[PDB]
Design a protein around this ligand. Structure first.
Ligand SMILES: N=C(N)N1CCCCC1
Ligand SMILES: [Ca+2]
Length: 223
């Protein structure tokens, strides 16, 4: 996250770190045994780390649970990033508490102008590299479809939305991928792609979760 703030330990209780020897992506806990992330975060050997603040220090609220299965969206296209969403099932249910909690799926899609919370352990610099140990946060509005398409000609599908600031300076970044965009207490986005980080006229692009609620629910119901 570039241009954000330190969230505070366990203040984003649905945020998970996906670990394969190191943090490589975010995700969102949506019930005791399932995480939503980005399809472009797929790999084998995933351990889900819940209850994290500093990802390099055991601070006492962590739960580390291996994935038992991963399900990339049927229609994911890795060239266009259309349908950039993946479900991960945990081998055992997480113990839910104030510090480790699921985030509700949306009942309705969110509108441009809605303020959301984006979070992750990604790079905090738009030029160069500095990766934080503790979770960072950014408050950002959803942008109109028109301005999203103007920023990225030929690239925005009905399964994507932009959020952030056209003036630059505030955005998600490398290592935030797969993490949450939460608006009014519902998971409306997944950190997906952009152009650099925090550049003028290049807002972040996010997977539009409301389009996937039926798929998520029916996948969970049979897996
Ligand atoms: N929001 C931006 N700029 N992103 C998404 C996360 C990876 C780097 C590109
Ligand atoms: Ca930790």
């Amino acid at each position: 996250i570039v241009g954000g703030y330190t969230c505070g330990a366990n203040t984003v209780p649905y945020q998970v770190s996906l670990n394969s020897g190191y943090h490589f992506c975010g995700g969102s806990l949506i019930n005791s045994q399932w995480v939503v992330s980005a399809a472009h975060c797929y790999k084998s050997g995933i351990q889900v780390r819940l209850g994290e603040d500093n990802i390099n220090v055991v601070e006492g609220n962590e739960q580390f649970i291996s994935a038992s299965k991963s399900i990339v969206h049927p229609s994911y296209n890795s060239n266009t990033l259309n349908n950039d969403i993946m479900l991960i099932k945990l081998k055992s249910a997480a113990s839910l508490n104030s510090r480790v909690a699921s985030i509700s799926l949306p009942t309705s899609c969110a509108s441009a102008g809605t303020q959301c919370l984006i979070s992750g352990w990604g790079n905090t610099k738009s030029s160069g590299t500095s990766y934080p140990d503790v979770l960072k946060c950014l408050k950002a509005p959803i942008l109109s479809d028109s301005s999203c398409k103007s920023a990225y000609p030929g690239q925005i599908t009905s399964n994507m939305f932009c959020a952030g600031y056209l003036e630059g300076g505030k955005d998600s970044c490398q290592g935030d991928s797969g993490g949450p965009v939460v608006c009014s207490g519902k998971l409306q986005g997944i950190v997906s792609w952009g152009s650099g980080c925090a550049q003028k006229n290049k807002p972040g692009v996010y997977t539009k979760v409301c389009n996937y609620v039926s798929w998520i629910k029916q996948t969970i119901a049979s897996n």
